[PDB]
Write a protein that binds this ligand. Structure first.
Ligand SMILES: [Zn+2]
Ligand SMILES: [Zn+2]
Ligand SMILES: [Zn+2]
Ligand SMILES: [Zn+2]
Length: 251
């Protein structure tokens, strides 16, 4: 549909990452304010999550237990916070250089786009064994998403492309998006449809699984969209750091 709502967040300064959970709570990294905020479905009351020490936080993800993960790229680290907790945990990633995106699968594995090092890395839940995923020839990989089957999707914007890698595969596929210019956020729905913020064209596009028929989502008044997320009903959420807002569009 074209049913668009601006969510009632307040005081945002360059929102960047966005994620939505199974309850419809929307999480946003307020990049210029070094904080992560949330709004429950239908709520009017934005809440700041109790992270501390962030410097340009960027990607955000939320697992099935409500633990929130944030890439803190100024500090080359990934931080998590269990729902309701006041102690944040710095995950044991090593050698990150400006990490931009984070995703978490149903087993709790955490995937990070290590933007400055041209790689995607992961940690299984509770492990210190960082593993590099066998993508090929990435160049400033930026956004990352993981679907219910463990396929990992990456905006490989230094190569102006979106790639995907099935769980256990050693051979990535390049998705046939049309007309991209430097993609940033990526998200994937329960049907495997892939949503991408085509940042250099100020638009959000989608491609159903295995399809070549790209659709531009009918948002109106987008200025500089950046991050994208999609909920279990197919509603799409986009951060716009040109006008400091978060917009949602029903399916
Ligand atoms: Zn950033
Ligand atoms: Zn980037
Ligand atoms: Zn980004
Ligand atoms: Zn941007």
């Amino acid at each position: 549909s074209n049913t668009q709502t601006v969510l009632p967040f307040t005081g945002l300064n360059t929102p960047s990452g966005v994620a939505v959970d199974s309850a419809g709570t929307v999480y946003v990294t307020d990049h210029g304010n070094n904080r992560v905020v949330k709004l429950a479905a239908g709520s009017t009351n934005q809440v700041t999550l109790p992270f501390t020490g962030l410097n340009t936080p960027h990607g955000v993800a939320v697992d099935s237990a409500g633990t929130v993960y944030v890439t803190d790229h100024g500090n080359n680290r990934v931080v998590k916070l269990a729902a309701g907790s006041n102690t944040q945990t710095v995950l044991p990633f090593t050698g990150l250089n400006t990490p931009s995106g984070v995703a978490v699968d149903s087993a709790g594995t955490v995937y990070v786009t290590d933007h400055g090092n041209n790689r995607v890395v992961k940690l299984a839940a509770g492990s210190t064994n960082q593993v590099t995923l066998p993508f090929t020839g990435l160049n400033t990989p930026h956004g990352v998403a993981v679907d219910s089957a463990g396929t990992v999707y990456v905006t490989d914007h230094g190569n102006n492309r979106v790639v995907k890698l099935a769980a256990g595969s050693n051979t990535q596929t390049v998705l046939p998006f049309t007309g991209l210019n430097t993609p940033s956020g990526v998200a994937v729905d329960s049907a495997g449809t892939v949503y991408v913020t085509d940042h250099g064209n100020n638009r959000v596009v989608k491609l159903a699984a295995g399809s070549t028929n790209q659709v531009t989502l009918p948002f109106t008044g987008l200025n500089t969209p950046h991050g994208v997320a999609v909920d279990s009903a197919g509603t799409v959420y986009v951060t716009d750091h040109g006008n400091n807002r978060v917009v949602k569009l029903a399916a």
